[PDB]
């Protein structure tokens, strides 16, 4: 059961990475202004 | 109490994801002007 | 305004710091087990 | 070891807090402009 | 100045992503145990 929960935590951290990359793309749009 | 502690980390990581999505909404508004 | 949206981003980052501190406390308890 | 991995995770979260504090500082500098 | 600050925010988010990748490495070894 502990191993199953550790796999869930890794999935949630990967989602944080995806959203941070979306923020970087938005910061580049702002940099053109 | 390891399963309890891992479930509490799951909830905190989900809350982090929610905050990142709220930040993206604000960056989009900033880009519009 | 620009000022309004930057201040809201600051509040959301401060909330992320609060949650990271709670995550550290959960890891500290796991380490003892 | 389990102890090594949990102690290193705690150190990485503390480094994340330091980055968030610097992100807040950059937003405050943007606000002044 | 505004462009310099936006580029610094991009660098800080890239540093966050690197820390999150390192956290995933540690959770991966804990899951194998």
Author numbering:
A (entry chain E), B (entry chain A), C (entry chain B), D (entry chain C), E (entry chain D): 1 to 33
What does the paper say about this structure?
CCs are quaternary structures comprising two or more α-helices supercoiled around each other with cyclic (Cn) or dihedral (Dn) symmetry. Here, we describe variants with all combinations of the aliphatic residues, Ile, Leu and Val, at a and d to give four classes of peptide: the ββ class, with a and d = Ile or Val; Lβ, a = Leu and d = Ile or Val; βL, a = Ile or Val and d = Leu; and LL, a = d = Leu. Peptides are named systematically appending the one-letter code for the amino acids at the a and d sites to “CC-Type2-“; e.g., CC-Hept becomes CC-Type2-LI. In summary, solution-phase data and X-ray crystal structures demonstrate conclusively that different classes of Type-2 coiled-coil (CC) peptides—i.e., based on abcdefg repeats with predominantly hydrophobic residues at a, d, e and g—adopt a range of distinct states.
Finally, we tested the importance of β-branched residues at d in maintaining open-barrels outside of our designs. A recent design of a parallel pentameric α-helical barrel 5H2L_2.125 has a single Ile residue at d. We mutated this to Leu to give 5H2L_2.1-I9L. The peptide formed a stable 4-helix assembly in solution but crystallised as a mixed parallel/antiparallel CC pentamer, which is another low-symmetry structure. Thus, the single β-branched residues at d appears critical for specifying the open, all-parallel, α-helical barrel of 5H2L_2.125. In addition to a/d combinations, residues larger than Ala at the e and g sites influence the state adopted as they strongly specify against high-order blunt-ended barrels and fully collapsed states. This is demonstrated with the 5H2L_2.1-I9L mutant that lacks β-branched residues at the a and d positions. The sequence crystallises as an antiparallel pentameric barrel instead of forming a collapsed structure.
